[PDB]
Design a protein around this nucleic acid. Structure first.
Ligand SMILES: *P(=O)(O)OC[C@H]1O[C@@H](n2cnc3c(N)ncnc32)[C@H](O)[C@@H]1O
Ligand SMILES: [Mn+2]
Ligand SMILES: [Mn+2]
Ligand SMILES: [Mn+2]
Ligand SMILES: [Mn+2]
Lengths: 252, 245, 439, 243
DNA sequence: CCTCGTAGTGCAGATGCGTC
DNA sequence: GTCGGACTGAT
DNA sequence: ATCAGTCCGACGACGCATCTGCACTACGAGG
């Protein structure tokens, strides 16, 4: 075989592709002995979109050689927008047509199979920035969206001061200020403080990134450093890893 | 003459299916059943609705009664009741018709009886080749998956599975085979391939949740025809001619 | 009822074949003579291409280009993109749909079960259906309206399915104007040409044409002269001629000339029967909805009984006295949220004439009576400004006025004509008003 | 001044639904009540909003004549971003407005103080020949049930009876409202008539949050009354005038 | 408390009007 | 508006 | 052989109306 993958949760797979499509219109998907790894970055390179799939979620795995299909989310997204039945059976295989997504839902007993045209290509190695981010924590999911929708209406800055291990968010402009606090798990679930620093990140891209945290019912890990790119780690409920890299813009 | 149906929700779908397809129609109240046939000015649709006079709380007819309406207006006020509620309708003069919402603080309404003239449509004696009984709610999945990007639906009557798909930018084939969760009854007859309009199969898909077993009846050299089954042998006969030629 | 749309279609066919206005008018007169009553007003409204003159304030039809393309594709049962491409090729959408009715047709549903009942269409039912289609907004709007429009389009014949497209565009490409129809009616009903002045004045009275036509076809030419200029149906402002500023105005007038100023902005007209405010634009359309606050200055600054005045609409700087561009003012006249920019967009109702006040005919008087009338019925304030009557001596003083205007900006100087026969009529261009412009 | 309202939902709701007739308002901080009495741009419907000294637990009184306005859109949009029944708190700054949410976490906002003042309260003291009481939910349901039919609305009355009737060319709306059926009790008056524009009295239905019940005073050719009672001695009023 | 679903509800995405 | 740009007579 | 008025429709570039689709969303409906 050259294409044999099966994923448990149709909703998790579609949320994955939604998070990826919110950052671009093309798809990069490489599949090898480690499973399926994915990556996509915007031209300005301020956000990062990577889809890592642990090779245990896939019920059936069968490949011939490490390959990558030049897939594009242009029209297929609204076609795939009719996948339901929670963990409905979804699988992908190979055909000379180019791609054939198979989704079967047992809520009413139907079969969704579609056709795409996208040829194969070449694989790229695992590509993740390596850095130490002393401050790290995994929190709830609505908290980040709250931060996005409460900071997007005062400007564009996004500065974090966790001094004395007491998290403070201060952003916006001088007049339309914002004061908020994050103590030890009072709205959070897990917190770890190692250093005191400032962030000064881009908040529009903050909302853009948090747009992709609808559905992943699991406390996602987050870390950052002093003016370093911020890291947000997500563990998919069915399975798959997709993280965030808020690339800063120096001290402008 | 007075009529109250304990439910109003049934009297929302048989108006949404009737709102867009035609501007005005005639409620031919009869001594036996509720005769409501409404052609379309476009002449590319035909929706006929037959309700036995037993859904109401035992309300009897006195004589033929011709209540005109305005579709948009008719559905404008009927959207009031979201809880369990009924509505009382009666009239005396053949000019004024009295419609009165009940349950909550009584709301009565006098509506002018309009006049619309239309010709009688000949009855249907057309045999067909497909006799599927697929999940009624699954048709929602099929249509909202196929005609979301396309502008034309096409059907093939295969040996033991309904082959609805739309080609073009992509071919989206979804099947409801006998095995998994699809058909419950089907007569094959003959192989048939046909296509239908992208909107006239979009309007007729918000009256679903009254029955739960359609019987699509069509074939080659035959226009589309489906009808649900309401309470007491309900008969909502909808028609649709094939596209292109 | 018994009539048909075929005959008017044929006459339209034999309408774009004569470029002589001395010939087409006679054929139009013969057509109107052979036309039938009880539908002639609707026929006329079809001729000018409007279901109803917009002094009634009706919302405009929403059909345009792409909607018509889609409807044509629907009625023809033909590919939408093919018709889009053909329209991109051939400019006339009428020809775009014309070939789509004879070589191939639309099957539909009625006919397969067996029924033979369909005859020629008539102007009465078509007009009624179009009127029903006209506003019919609702919420689930466009699908129903386009369905009915395409159905009626399919309800025709291949030859006649060309004028309808233009009938929806907003113009009739037969080159037959309104004055030509007026003179044709004068020739036909009157028999002599002298029945043209009464038609002219009748048009001067009301902005309508259908009611005037029906009262003409009911009794006759007579019983129209004593019809006073009534509050209600609007009366359009007169026109003028454009030219330079030569040594011509003083000699043409002959004596002391009424030196006025060239103002800017959308004009105004008011029709108040002491109870309600009717405002009509420079064209024949209400602006009360977009101008709620101007219906109030008239009630207090102008004192008397039912009166008719003509004004103008231009913004004023709020910081101090300074004019504002019409382009900036365009944004104000679009929204229902009046109480966010109307108070920040001050507009003065400049008055230059009091047309019809003392409950009887007034427009047949020279240009001193109205000028003196307007100076008295006024309230001292800066919110309303009147004709700044400045009297000069010669061109050098006249050029001084233009220099002052240029220093203060604005359009410039406009001068009217005063004489015994020089009166504010309705129609033509005339020398009554002279507007000056240059580079 | 420091405020802390136990209902961050209902107070935001009432301010938002009153921010559809005004475009600006002022707060007069005093000993026992901070009032909101503004006049509509159309000079059609005047509205006044009063609050007690007990609406908000933990309230602080600083000065007797603190007068603060705002910009309507800023406050409306900011308080559109309120999550649930969180113990919203406020503080008064001499030159700016200070907001600080307090729920599952701690938020805050800041808004400047804009100078504005226009006090023209039209004294009413009118002899309305009617007085009746009904509960908020019924009123909201009946108002919004027939709003989307036009603009004609006539509040005709009878002897100790209050009735809503809406008339259109193609159809009409009659809503019987007797104390027998749904009109509570305390009905008194005589046969009068009046009329009001549909939208003007329709858009003031979103007062179903800080609501206990409501009264109704009206008559003929007399400004209609709409007293929207609020918990603990609160009530906002919507004085509209007949056409 | 845990699932829907459902009519609202706000937000882009179209097309067309009246003014030069 | 708007400027052509065609259409009607005359010395 | 040449002049003075004089009627009559294209010019497209559009700001904003107004519907349409169309993802979310708080609340009701039952286990
Ligand atoms: P354009 O904007 O040039 O003209 C619009 C209308 O304004 C009227 N108008 C301008 N100036 C005057 C004077 N001085 N007197 C009377 N009317 C004036 C024109 O009639 C235009 O219709
Ligand atoms: Mn118009
Ligand atoms: Mn249009
Ligand atoms: Mn002007
Ligand atoms: Mn138009």
């Amino acid at each position: 075989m050259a294409f044999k993958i099966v994923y448990p949760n149709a909703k998790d797979f579609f949320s994955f592709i939604n998070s990826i499509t919110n950052v671009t219109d093309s798809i990069i998907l490489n599949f090898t002995e480690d499973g399926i790894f994915s990556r996509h970055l915007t031209e300005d390179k301020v956000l990062m979109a990577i889809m890592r799939i642990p090779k245990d979620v896939l019920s059936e795995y069968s490949i011939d050689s490490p390959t990558s299909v030049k897939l594009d989310v242009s029209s297929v997204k609204k076609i795939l927008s009719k996948a339901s039945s929670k963990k409905a059976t979804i699988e992908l295989t190979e055909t000379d047509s180019g791609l054939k997504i198979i989704i079967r839902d047992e809520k009413s007993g139907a079969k969704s199979t579609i056709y795409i045209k996208a040829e194969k290509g070449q694989v790229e190695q695992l590509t993740e920035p390596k850095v130490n981010l002393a401050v790290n924590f995994t929190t709830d999911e609505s908290v980040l969206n709250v931060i996005a929708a409460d900071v997007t209406l005062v400007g564009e800055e996004m500065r974090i001061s966790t001094e004395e291990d007491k998290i403070k968010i201060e952003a916006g402009e001088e007049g339309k200020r914002y004061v908020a606090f994050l103590m030890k798990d009072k709205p959070l679930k897990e917190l770890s403080i190692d250093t005191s620093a400032s962030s000064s990140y881009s908040a529009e891209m903050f909302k853009d990134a948090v747009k992709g945290l609808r559905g992943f019912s699991a406390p996602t890990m987050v870390s950052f450093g002093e003016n370093l790119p911020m890291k947000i780690d997500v563990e998919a409920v069915s399975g798959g890893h997709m993280i965030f890299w808020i690339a800063p813009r120096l001290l402008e | 003459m007075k009529v109250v149906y304990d439910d109003v929700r049934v009297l929302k779908d048989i108006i949404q299916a009737l709102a867009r397809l035609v501007d005005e129609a005639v409620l031919k109240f009869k001594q036996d059943s509720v005769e409501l046939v409404a052609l379309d000015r476009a002449h590319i649709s035909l929706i006929s609705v037959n309700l036995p006079r037993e859904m109401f709380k035992e309300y009897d007819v006195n004589d033929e009664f011709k209540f005109g309406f305005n579709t948009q207006y008719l559905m404008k006020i009927l959207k009031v009741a979201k809880r369990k509620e009924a509505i009382e309708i009666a009239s005396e003069s053949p000019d004024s018709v009295i419609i009165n919402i009940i349950g909550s603080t009584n709301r009565e309404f006098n509506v002018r009886n309009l006049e619309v003239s239309e010709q009688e449509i000949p009855e249907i004696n057309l045999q067909f080749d497909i006799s599927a009984t697929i999940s009624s709610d699954g048709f929602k999945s099929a249509i909202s998956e196929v005609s979301t990007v396309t502008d034309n639906v096409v059907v093939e009557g295969h040996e033991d599975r309904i082959l609805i798909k739309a080609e073009g930018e992509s071919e989206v084939e979804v099947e409801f085979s006998k095995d998994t969760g699809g058909l419950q009854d089907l007569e094959f007859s003959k192989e048939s391939k046909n296509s239908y309009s992208a909107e006239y199969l979009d309007d007729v898909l918000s009256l679903t949740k009254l029955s739960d077993y359609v019987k699509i009846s069509f074939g080659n050299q035959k226009p589309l025809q489906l009808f649900f089954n309401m309470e007491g042998g309900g008969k909502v006969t909808y028609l649709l001619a094939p596209k292109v030629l | 009822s018994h009539m048909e749309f075929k005959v008017i279609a044929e006459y339209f066919d034999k309408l774009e074949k004569i470029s002589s206005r001395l010939q087409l008018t006679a054929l139009l007169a013969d057509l109107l003579s052979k036309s039938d009553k009880t539908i002639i007003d609707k026929v006329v409204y079809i001729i000018q291409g409007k279901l109803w003159p917009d002094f009634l304030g009706y919302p405009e039809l929403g059909i345009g280009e792409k909607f018509l393309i889609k409807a044509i594709s629907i009625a023809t049962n033909t590919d939408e993109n093919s018709v889009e491409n053909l329209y991109k090729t051939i400019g006339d959408l009428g020809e775009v749909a014309r070939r789509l009715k004879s070589k191939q047709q639309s099957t539909g549903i009625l006919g397969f079960l067996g029924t033979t009942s369909k005859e020629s269409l008539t102007v009465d039912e078509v007009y009624s259906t179009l009127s029903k289609v006209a506003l019919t907004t609702g919420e689930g709007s466009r699908d129903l309206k386009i369905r009915l429009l395409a159905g009626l389009l399919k309800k025709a014949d291949p030859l006649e399915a060309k004028f309808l497209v233009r009938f929806v565009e907003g113009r009739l490409r037969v080159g037959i104007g309104d004055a030509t129809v007026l003179d044709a009616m004068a020739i036909a009903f009157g028999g002599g040409q002298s029945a043209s002045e009464i038609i002219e004045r009748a048009y001067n009275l009301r902005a309508d044409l259908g009611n005037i036509a029906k009262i003409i076809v009911e009794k006759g030419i007579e019983a129209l002269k004593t019809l006073k200029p009534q509050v209600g149906i609007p009366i359009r402002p007169m026109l003028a001629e454009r030219l330079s500023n030569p040594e011509e105005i003083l000699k043409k007038m002959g004596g002391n000339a009424i030196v006025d100023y060239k103002y800017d902005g959308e004009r105004a007209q008011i029709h108040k029967k002491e109870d309600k405010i009717f405002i009509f634009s420079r064209r024949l359309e209400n602006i009360t909805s977009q101008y709620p606050d101007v219906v109030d200055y008239v009630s207090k600054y102008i004192e008397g009984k039912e009166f008719i005045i003509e004004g103008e609409i231009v913004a004023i700087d709020p910081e101090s006295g300074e004019m504002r561009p019409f382009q900036e003012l365009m944004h104000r006249k679009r929204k229902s949220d009046i109480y966010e920019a109307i108070k920040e967009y001050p507009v003065n109702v400049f008055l230059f004439d009091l047309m019809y006040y003392e409950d009887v005919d007034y427009t047949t008087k020279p240009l001193e009576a109205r000028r003196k009338l307007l100076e008295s019925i006024v309230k001292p304030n800066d919110y309303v400004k009147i004709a700044h009557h400045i009297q000069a001596n010669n061109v050098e003083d006249l050029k001084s006025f233009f220099y002052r205007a240029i220093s203060e900006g604005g359009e410039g100087v406009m001068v009217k004509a005063i004489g015994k026969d020089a009166i504010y009529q309705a129609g033509a261009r005339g020398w009554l008003w002279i507007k000056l412009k240059r580079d | 001044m420091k405020a802390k309202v136990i209902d961050a939902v209902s107070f935001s709701y009432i301010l938002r639904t009153v921010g559809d007739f005004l475009s600006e308002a002022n707060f007069i901080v005093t000993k026992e009540g901070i009032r909101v009495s503004g006049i509509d741009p159309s000079r059609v419907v005047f509205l006044d909003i009063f609050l007690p000294s007990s609406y908000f637990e933990g309230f602080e009184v600083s000065q007797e004549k603190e007068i603060i306005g705002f910009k309507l859109e800023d406050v409306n949009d900011i308080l559109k971003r309120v999550l649930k029944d969180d113990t919203l708190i406020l503080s008064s700054n001499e030159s700016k407005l200070t907001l600080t949410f307090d729920g599952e976490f701690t938020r805050s906002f800041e808004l400047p103080l804009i100078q504005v003042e226009s006090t023209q309260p039209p004294s009413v003291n009118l002899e309305f020949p009617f007085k009746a009481q009904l509960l908020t939910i019924t009123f909201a349901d009946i108002i919004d049930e027939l709003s989307d039919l036009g603009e004609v609305l006539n509040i005709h009355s009878k002897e100790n009876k209050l009735y809503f009737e809406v008339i259109g060319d193609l159809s009409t709306a009659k809503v019987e409202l007797s104390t027998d059926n749904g009109t509570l009790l305390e009905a008194s008056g005589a046969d009068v008539s009046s009329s009001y524009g549909m939208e003007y009295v329709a858009n003031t239905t979103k007062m179903r949050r800080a609501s206990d019940s409501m009264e109704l005073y009206f008559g003929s050719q007399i400004p209609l009354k709409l007293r929207f009672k609020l918990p603990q001695e609160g009530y906002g009023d919507f004085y509209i005038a007949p056409r």
